[PDB]
Each structure stands twice: as structure tokens, then as C-alpha cells.
Amino acid sequence: YESTTMPNQVGIPFKALIERPGYAGLPLSLVVIKSELVPSLVQDYITCNYKTVV
């Protein structure tokens, strides 16, 4: 029943079959569209150009 470990490559369909003896089930095709690095970040500073006023 369960369990394959597929590699991450985009747009390329990986074929996993891992089901019970005798194949008659649903073949698993899985694609990675994109991976999405979602940040958990700390803001160090803001910087910009500046106007000194005399």
C-alpha cells in the first residue's frame, strides 16, 4: 500500500507503484510544479537614501 520516496525534479512525472500483489489499482503519477520556500524570517533593519538637513 504505502510508501515511495520520489526525487524532486520539476515537470517530470514520477511513477510510483507500491500496491498489493496483482496490479489492477490506480497508478500514481506525481509532478512537482514548483517548490515554494516560504520564509520564517527576522527583519534585521531598513535602509535607504537619506536627506541631511542643515
Site residues (vs another protein, CB under 8 A): 49, 51, 53
Q: Is the Cβ of residue 8 or residue 47 nearer to another protein in the bound state?
A: 47
Question: 3-state secondary structure string, the chain?
Answer: CCCCCCCCCECCCEEECCCCCCCCCCCEEECECCCCCCCCCCCCCCCCCCCCCC
At its nearest, how many Å lie between another protein and the CB of residue 50?
10
User: Whose Cβ is closer to another protein: residue 24's or residue 53's?
Assistant: 53
Least distance to another protein from the beta carbon of 2, Å? 55
